[PDB]
Design a protein around this ligand. Sequence first.
Ligand SMILES: [Ca+2]
Ligand SMILES: [Ca+2]
Ligand SMILES: [Ca+2]
Ligand SMILES: [Ca+2]
Ligand SMILES: [Ca+2]
Ligand code: NA
Ligand code: NA
Ligand code: NA
Ligand code: NA
Lengths: 295, 295
Amino acid sequence: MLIRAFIPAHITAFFVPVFHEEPLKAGSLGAGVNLSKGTNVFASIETGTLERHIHVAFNGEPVKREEAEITYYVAEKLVPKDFLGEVEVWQYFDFPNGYGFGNSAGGALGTALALSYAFGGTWLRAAQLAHEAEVKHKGGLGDVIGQLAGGIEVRIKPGGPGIGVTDNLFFEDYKVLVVPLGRLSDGDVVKAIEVEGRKALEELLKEPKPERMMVLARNFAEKTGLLPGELSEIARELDKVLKNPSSMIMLGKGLFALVRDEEAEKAKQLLSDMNLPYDIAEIYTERPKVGRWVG
Amino acid sequence: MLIRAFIPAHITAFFVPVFHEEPLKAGSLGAGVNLSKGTNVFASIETGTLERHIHVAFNGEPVKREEAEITYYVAEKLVPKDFLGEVEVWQYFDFPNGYGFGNSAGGALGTALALSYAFGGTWLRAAQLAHEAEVKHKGGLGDVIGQLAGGIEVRIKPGGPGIGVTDNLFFEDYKVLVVPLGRLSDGDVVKAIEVEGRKALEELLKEPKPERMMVLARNFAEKTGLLPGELSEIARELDKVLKNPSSMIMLGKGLFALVRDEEAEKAKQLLSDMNLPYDIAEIYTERPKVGRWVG
Ligand SMILES: [Ca+2]
Ligand SMILES: [Ca+2]
Ligand SMILES: [Ca+2]
Ligand SMILES: [Ca+2]
Ligand SMILES: [Ca+2]
Ligand code: NA
Ligand code: NA
Ligand code: NA
Ligand code: NA
């Protein structure tokens, strides 16, 4: 009667937004990584009454539909119009909202998988609806499909579940370091993304490697202006300890870098030394989880 | 400095909604008529200040953007983001909202034509944006394109301006009678529209005539349940005086009928006798008007 779903946090390395009035045809090209840390969605469902009510919560606290619009958009569709009872969606995040980790995609997909599992449906149907809700409410373009691909994904063909095409890269002994700082809040960069992005992608499909991605990323963030100087400065210090270049967490004020178990502890020192906040998450190589919550 | 635009009221005879996530590909198949009575949009524009503000009004009274969402959607796009001054859109309707006359399409198109004329643009660009705004805010599917076609239009290929295809029928000595009553406020009819509608269209392209349309309409409204009994009863009385069958104003609680100058006066008696409200409008055979307001 209680369904749990887990969606990994998604961090984009670089990207190219392909906006399209058709949700399923809408998406983005680019590369990202999925963390072992993410969103846990719990769907509680009880039959009864003479009324149909859906309730949503973020980290234990109830949320108005105006702040949960994406999750409600999904729930409204997945919960039968003639259903009588109460549906509760409890979402728990491991990262703050608007920090570039893809929480809304997690809430959209987690919700869609948990409810489809309860009220009937499939993975592709649930996946598409979650994608749809993101694009519809300006939630995101590559988080939902990137989370379905898992691990180190690469969106080579723009589109939603069942339509787009993503690939995965191989990697070894890599963990993810993240220095989350905050949110973000010009026509010049739009054309700087169309170019640097498509360039970074083509260059990655030439050398399919994580190292290559981290280099193609660090360039993308700077060659587009997107990368803040205040971040670039934190980067230049981290780099001195990492075999790979840290890069901006796309659309979030922060940085990330793939690191071995050694460079990690070394970087932990430099960062805690700079009075900076950091997190270490493993690369979630698996796929989203949905099932009866049994522990 | 003051631009005026006139969009005829649009009354649909019957239809078939083709919903499509791509606004321009979205539309409806069907037939309608454009009245000499409609919406007059006046755009007042003054340069100056250090601020950019858009104001909207319906029948002399200012309206919040939440009630003017469609008009603001348009204005926001047509009014330069770097513009400094005040833009005022005064809309005047000849028919109440939600009565099936297409006021929102009139407000959307009128606004789009008046502003494009002021801030630069074209008919197709303005026309498409107005169509877009309708579909986006669930405003309508065939009003904007039907109003561009003018006269007695027939949407044979679903789509928006520049994409869809409408045709026009010939007619003679015909005027329009309308008995507006109110608004409207089941999966069964959805399939009743897909079938009766596409049927009415195919039957019209066999006999391109207004008489035929008025017959194919009176059937469509009933064979789908859409036609209220309380309306059907008013109809059965009108019919006794009209060479042509009155039909329901699609998506509005009312009726309409093409009438000669004679049956008109005769019908005016029967209706004023039934304590009913009625209006006589000529068929607006022309196209929407836009130009500097010079009287
Ligand atoms: Ca759309
Ligand atoms: Ca957690
Ligand atoms: Ca390890
Ligand atoms: Ca008037
Ligand atoms: Ca006459
Ligand atoms: Na997340
Ligand atoms: Na992978
Ligand atoms: Na109108
Ligand atoms: Na005509």
